[PDB]
């Protein structure tokens, strides 16, 4: 558990801007709750989580030759870290 | 597994078609294709390097597949189909009036 709820990090110009505040954001397994996430992260980076905003992403639907399909849908959570704290791991 | 056949990475004599009578080493086997390799069939493929890193890739171009029924293994003597001996414990292949 815990390292199953957090999947990867976003990676976008939008998501980066975020790091100025303690606002790091992650692809997160879509059945997880705001609470699940908060605790999952608390243990993943020993930082203190102060606010969670979550949102779903309809997976884009794409093609290859006559084979028409979808990408998997996702959920991303954008998590606030306490003032002073930061996640060094995400600072690339 | 339904795939299996005669020879492996070793010396084999071709009896094929163009490369009839040929003797080549290791056949580098498929067997998806029931094909092998030897130094038998050869052709030119056209190129410009997958990336023109070290520009051209070159031009001599290497060996075609060749049906595994074209080759025939060999030892003290010639071609010979393979036969299969008990060994008293395991199981190896010996050629007709020969061994391995």
């Amino acid at each position: 558990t815990a390292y199953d709820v957090i999947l990867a990090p976003v990676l976008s110009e939008k998501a980066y801007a975020g790091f100025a505040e303690g606002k790091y954001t992650f692809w997160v397994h879509p059945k997880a709750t705001k609470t699940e996430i908060k605790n999952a992260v608390e243990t993943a980076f020993k930082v203190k989580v102060v606010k969670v905003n979550t949102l779903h992403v309809r997976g884009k639907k794409k093609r290859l030759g006559r084979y028409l399909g979808k990408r998997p849908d996702r959920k991303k959570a954008i998590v606030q870290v306490a003032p002073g704290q930061k996640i060094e791991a995400l600072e690339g | 597994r339904v795939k299996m056949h005669v020879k492996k990475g070793d010396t084999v004599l071709v009896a094929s078609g163009k490369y009839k009578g040929r003797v080549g080493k290791v056949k580098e086997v498929l067997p998806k294709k029931y094909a092998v390799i030897v130094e038998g069939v050869n052709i030119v493929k056209k190129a410009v390097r997958v990336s023109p890193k070290y520009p051209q890739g070159g031009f001599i171009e290497k060996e075609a597949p060749l049906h595994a029924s074209k080759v025939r293994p060999i030892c003290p003597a010639c071609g010979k189909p393979t036969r299969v001996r008990k060994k008293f414990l395991e199981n190896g292949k010996k050629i007709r009036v020969c061994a391995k």
Partner: protein, 71 residues
């Protein structure tokens, strides 16, 4: 790999539920760390991932066999 696996089991098979749990928790983490730098390109050697998911399958499979007559 194959012999490595053979041994990975040998130890795994003599640990205790308690300890398996803790070890898993660790491999689970390494895996996250992989899929992170998997996902930025910047260092990633493919096989290393399938390799660790199975590592973990192995442990949890073992943890199941433990848990029947022991805890």
């Amino acid at each position: 790999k194959l012999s490595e696996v053979r041994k990975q089991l040998e130890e795994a098979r003599k640990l205790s539920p308690v300890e398996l749990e803790k070890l898993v928790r660790e491999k689970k983490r390494e895996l996250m760390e992989l899929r992170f730098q998997a996902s930025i390109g910047q260092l990633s050697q493919n096989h290393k991932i399938r390799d660790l998911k199975r590592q973990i399958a192995r442990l949890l499979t073992v943890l199941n066999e433990k848990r029947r007559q022991n805890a």
